[PDB]
């Protein structure tokens, strides 16, 4: 009867609603208000996801959340919280993918390739700054520096590759830089790695 | 049975509520479960449709979903997406780039900017319009790029601008105002001051200094 | 101690000079900044466009550096403006879009 | 006694640097403020009375044949981007049309 | 620069944290061992913990120390004191909820 | 209906627009080049435009037969 048509509208939305939260945020309407949800994720490889609860009484507060600490999330609230909620959300996604994407690549880099890297290399909480030196199977040992100035991309704002313990001797060491650099400017972190280390 | 419609009525106004939102409409969702396994293996295909407000879209992907013993790897192996064959090729063009790369969330960002973007343009051309009806040409309409300025004097001095919509590699996107000066000899001929070679860049410093509609309707005023 | 102080001494007189020449200059801007719109309108909530947009290449100087024969394209180019064959095409395609735009 | 005087000199240094910074910010943003309404307000008007005076100079020939410079080619370019995407522009309408039919 | 006989000791640990044991001493005097001060600093975060142990007496030299290390302008002291340190951890960073409604 | 008349008035003229087009080698000259072509927007080239404006003419006979013509206050007016 009516309860087979009843049932199945319930699957129906409860399907529409898993499916919308694929899209990347989600909602739920609780007590004091909404709690939104925030998925990252890095080249098709799914990460972790955060947690946000807001109240709908004006004006607009934030019970809690899972965000960590230095991610600048106290500034973007107090700009965007008031007014175009949706802009708040998107940009809090961004800073999130972001800041995943670069782990990701920083942990992969760490992980994978230990051959190529002599010592442990240097990183900070937020990953806007990553230094390592390495030597590659002749002996060509540099370092390099990469500094992301720009909290909402994965690719360093600017790299800097030195030749240390050894002087230039030939053109080779000049091209290799060369690509070096350009390679960590433009190509991600692991990638420019796994196409060098062949 | 009012208790059932009661969370029926519930559940679709908590469903429209994210809808107008977040800014997604969702259509139906298929999802299909393989199992191979060898530690475990377990291939998930989803299809789903849905629109942003002005532009319809159709995804498709796979998943392959590696459970063990202390990791659950979850990467989107396959993805095709399919929309309306518009005339934006910016559009496709990103489109493609998302579907080498196989990512899903950068994708929802952007169009959701995009369709922003259009939308402004949109509003924005059109309010200009109706309030100087004897300044402007909209020859293409508002869902455009170009812009058209004349006087109904004389057809021989008008000027265009330029208002497109761009998409880096990283995903963003940005505009761009230009503008083109097509104007007679006869005005070159008649002023050796040589002020107009110089009137876009300039005219970036105008939009640059107290905004763009009021630098659109500055020069409309001038022009008039 | 006394490196300190000539650095801190140094830092308060530089800072007294700039804050009474950021104090005039504001105060003269004032009188320019309310003459530029005198004729003009003083000024929809359109976000402003990021400094990148206006420091961007321009279309202009792209298009005329980017292809040849100018005159040898606009010798018909001019042509074609004046023929009524399109412009009768242009004016079928706008009636079209605004028959579009009624619904 | 000395410590204590070199502790308060530091911490007076460290309060004192950011205000100048503010200072100096506020100054060098300003003045390029000025500078571009002033070039603005300059290009502004100088365009306005050309085209004031330009307007009876095609009233003495109402339709002469006016040719065009080089800079006008980037414009009649974009005037003929619909001309040479008609074949797109019915391709929009009769998507449009089959979405319109679709009753 | 400040003190003349002082000693430091660095242990960089992960949680992005970093141990300081600081033994304190004058131009006249050797450092005393006895009387250390620890420190508990989070990187690129505001909040800093210390062990209330000699540090009164040094109290303002400390934080010029890490506010101008830190790259920082001025520094306050909360009013909250406690020996269990992981709750004054989930107290200031305000993270001992972490129960969220979803369906999924 | 003034409709029919100009759809044939346009579709005469079809013939002489592709001739004025055909008649320089430059405009095709400039084609193949993107350069030019995602500065204008989409492309320059029409050489199907006998299909094109032969498709519309069904659909537009069948629509002359059918004749087809802050914040909280935001988040506020939705639960309601």
Redesign the interface.
């Given at each position: 009867n009516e309860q087979e048509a009843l049932e199945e509208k319930l699957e129906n939305v409860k399907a529409i609603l898993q499916a919308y939260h694929f899209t990347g945020l989600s909602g739920k309407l609780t007590s004091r208000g909404v709690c939104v949800c925030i998925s990252t994720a890095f080249e098709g490889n799914l990460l972790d996801s955060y947690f946000v609860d807001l109240v709908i009484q004006k004006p607009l507060r934030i019970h809690h959340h899972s965000v960590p600490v230095f991610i600048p999330l106290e500034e973007i609230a107090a700009k965007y919280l008031q007014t175009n909620i949706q802009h708040f959300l998107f940009s809090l996604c961004e800073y999130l993918n972001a800041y995943s994407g670069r782990k990701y690549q920083a942990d992969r880099l760490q992980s994978d390739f230990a051959a190529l890297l002599t010592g442990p290399l240097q990183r900070n909480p937020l990953c806007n700054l990553l230094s390592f030196t390495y030597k590659l199977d002749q002996s060509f040992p540099f370092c390099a520096r990469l500094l992301y100035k720009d909290l909402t991309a994965t690719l360093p704002t600017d790299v800097t590759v030195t030749c240390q313990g050894v002087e230039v001797l030939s053109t080779s060491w000049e091209e290799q830089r060369a690509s070096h650099e350009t390679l960590f400017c433009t190509k991600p972190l692991h990638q420019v790695f796994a196409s060098f280390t062949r | 049975s009012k208790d059932l419609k009661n969370q029926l009525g519930h559940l679709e106004s908590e469903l429209s509520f994210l809808s107008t939102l977040t800014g997604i409409n969702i259509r139906n969702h298929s999802k299909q479960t393989e199992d191979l396994t060898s530690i475990r293996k377990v291939l998930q295909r989803h299809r789903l449709s849905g629109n942003c407000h002005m532009v319809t879209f159709q995804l498709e992907f796979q998943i392959l979903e590696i459970q063990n013993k202390e990791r659950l790897s979850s990467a989107v192996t396959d993805l095709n997406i399919i929309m309306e064959p518009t005339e934006c090729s910016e559009l496709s063009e990103f489109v493609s780039r998302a579907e080498e790369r196989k990512d899903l969330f950068m994708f929802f960002r952007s169009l959701h900017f995009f369709v922003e973007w259009f939308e402004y343009r949109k509003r924005t051309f059109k309010h200009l319009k109706e309030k100087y009806p004897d300044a402007v040409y909209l020859s293409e309409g508002p869902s455009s790029c170009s812009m058209g300025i004349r006087s109904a004097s004389r057809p021989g001095f008008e000027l265009v601008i330029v208002w497109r919509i761009q998409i880096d590699e990283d995903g963003k996107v940005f505009p761009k105002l230009d503008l083109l000066t097509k104007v007679p000899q006869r005005a070159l001929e008649l002023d050796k001051n040589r002020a107009i070679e110089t009137a876009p860049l300039s005219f970036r410093t105008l939009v640059g200094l107290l905004g763009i509609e009021a630098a659109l309707e500055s020069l409309i005023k001038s022009l008039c | 101690i006394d490196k300190m102080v000539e650095t801190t001494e140094l830092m308060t007189g530089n800072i007294q000079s700039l804050k009474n020449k950021i104090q005039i200059l504001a105060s003269e801007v004032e009188e320019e900044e309310e003459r530029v719109k005198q004729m003009h309108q003083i000024n929809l909530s359109l976000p402003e466009l990021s400094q990148k947009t206006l420091k961007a290449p321009t279309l202009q100087k792209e298009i005329l550096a980017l292809i040849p024969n100018q005159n040898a394209l606009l010798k018909d180019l001019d042509i074609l403006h004046n023929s009524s064959q399109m412009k009768s095409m242009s004016t079928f395609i706008e009636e079209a879009y605004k028959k579009l735009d009624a619904s | 006694k000395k410590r204590q005087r070199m502790i308060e000199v530091q911490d007076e240094l460290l309060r004192l640097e950011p205000q100048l910074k503010q200072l100096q910010t506020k100054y060098d943003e300003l003045k390029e403020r000025k500078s571009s309404l002033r070039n603005a307000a300059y290009f502004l008007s100088n365009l306005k009375q050309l085209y004031q005076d330009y307007s009876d100079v095609q009233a003495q020939e109402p339709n002469v044949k006016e040719t065009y410079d080089s800079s006008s080619l980037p414009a009649l370019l974009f005037k003929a981007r619909t001309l040479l995407g008609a074949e797109s522009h019915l391709r929009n309408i009769n998507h449009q049309l089959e979405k319109l039919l679709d009753q | 620069r400040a003190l003349k006989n002082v000693t430091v000791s660095f242990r960089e640990t992960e949680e992005n944290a970093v141990w300081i044991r600081i033994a304190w001493g004058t131009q006249y005097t050797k450092p005393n061992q006895y009387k250390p001060t620890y420190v508990v600093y989070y990187s690129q975060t505001p909040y800093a913990f210390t062990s209330s142990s000699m540090l009164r007496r040094n109290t303002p030299l400390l934080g010029q120390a890490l506010t101008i290390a830190s790259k920082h302008h001025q520094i306050v002291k909360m009013d909250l004191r406690s020996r269990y340190l992981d709750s004054l951890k989930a107290i200031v960073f305000k993270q001992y909820n972490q129960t969220f409604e979803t369906h999924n | 209906d003034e409709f029919m008349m100009?759809l044939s008035?346009?579709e005469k003229?079809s013939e002489?627009?592709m001739e004025?087009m055909q008649?320089?080698s430059?405009?095709q000259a400039?084609e193949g080049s993107r350069?030019?072509?995602?500065?204008?927007?989409?492309?320059?080239?029409?050489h199907?435009?006998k299909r094109?404006?032969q498709?519309?003419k069904e659909?537009?006979t069948?629509?002359n037969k059918?004749k087809?013509?802050?914040?909280?206050e935001?988040?506020?007016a939705?639960?309601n």
């Open positions: - | - | - | - | - | 100009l008035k346009v003229l002489e627009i004025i008649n320089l430059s405009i400039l350069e030019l072509e995602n500065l204008i927007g989409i492309s320059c080239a029409s199907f435009l094109e404006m498709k519309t659909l537009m069948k629509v059918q087809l013509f802050d914040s909280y935001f988040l506020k939705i639960l």
